[PDB]
Amino acid sequence: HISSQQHEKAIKSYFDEAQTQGVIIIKEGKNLSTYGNALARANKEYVPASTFKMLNALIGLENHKATTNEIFKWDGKKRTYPMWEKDMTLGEAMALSAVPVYQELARRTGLELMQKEVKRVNFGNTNIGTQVDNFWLVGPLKITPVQEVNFADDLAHNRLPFKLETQEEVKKMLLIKEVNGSKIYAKSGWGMGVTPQVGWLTGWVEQANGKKIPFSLNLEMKEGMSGSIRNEITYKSLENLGII
Ligand SMILES: *[B]([O])([O])[C][N]S(=O)(=O)[C]C1=[C][C]=[C]C(C([O])=O)=[C]1
């Protein structure tokens, strides 16, 4: 067995080498562990960015604003990324992190119902303000990494206050990787309309044996960083800890 000094040093080095600052929080049962090169980030608020898609989708499905097979049609207007210029389900929009689709869903839900559901879930600071289509991108909604891993822990275990079927539909949308009989469920986030920019990967490992290990990586993205650094640092960290 590797010392935890070694674990903490190895995981800190993954952040150091990506030349960023960040934290990965791992929950094992009820025990939270904080790793990385900027531990104090663990209890600081950031916009949830596209991590909010998880709750956005729970809210919309529970409230019959969409079904899992409905196709959100591209309206033909130029999008920020050409990959978004196509027709997609909530599932496909989740994988592509297609903001316009999740904005449409937010608009269907409406400000009033959205506010009620976010308070009911008590997600982050629970504050959505007045614009139903961008509160998760630029504020006022904010959340700590500890809160994000706890949200992930809830979803993984079907503990959120939504039907089981709602939760299962959403979890099916989040499978991003399989590694030696482990499945990684997670949602990326990248908040580019805040400064500094925040990057997220929040989810859980479902191990071969049934155990679900939640995690939230939170870091600072800067210009010319690749998105996949969030993934790379996560996988390296989970492997270093023998979680995958
Ligand atoms: B959300 O935070 O992922 C949306 N962020 S974005 O629209 O500013 C840029 C973007 C596009 C596609 C994928 C990502 C990502 O986070 O994986 C981000």
Author numbering: 32 to 275
Sentences reproduced from the published study:
One of the most important mechanisms is the production of β-lactamase enzymes capable of hydrolyzing β-lactam antibiotics. Herein, we describe the activity of CR167 against other β-lactamases in A. baumannii: the cefepime-hydrolysing class C extended-spectrum β-lactamase (ESAC) ADC-33 and the carbapenem-hydrolyzing OXA-24/40 (class D). The nucleophilic attack of the catalytic serine on the boron atom forms a tetrahedral adduct, which mimics the acylation (or deacylation) tetrahedral structure of the high-energy intermediate formed during β-lactam hydrolysis. The structures of OXA-24/40 and ADC-33 in complex with CR167 and select chiral analogues were obtained.
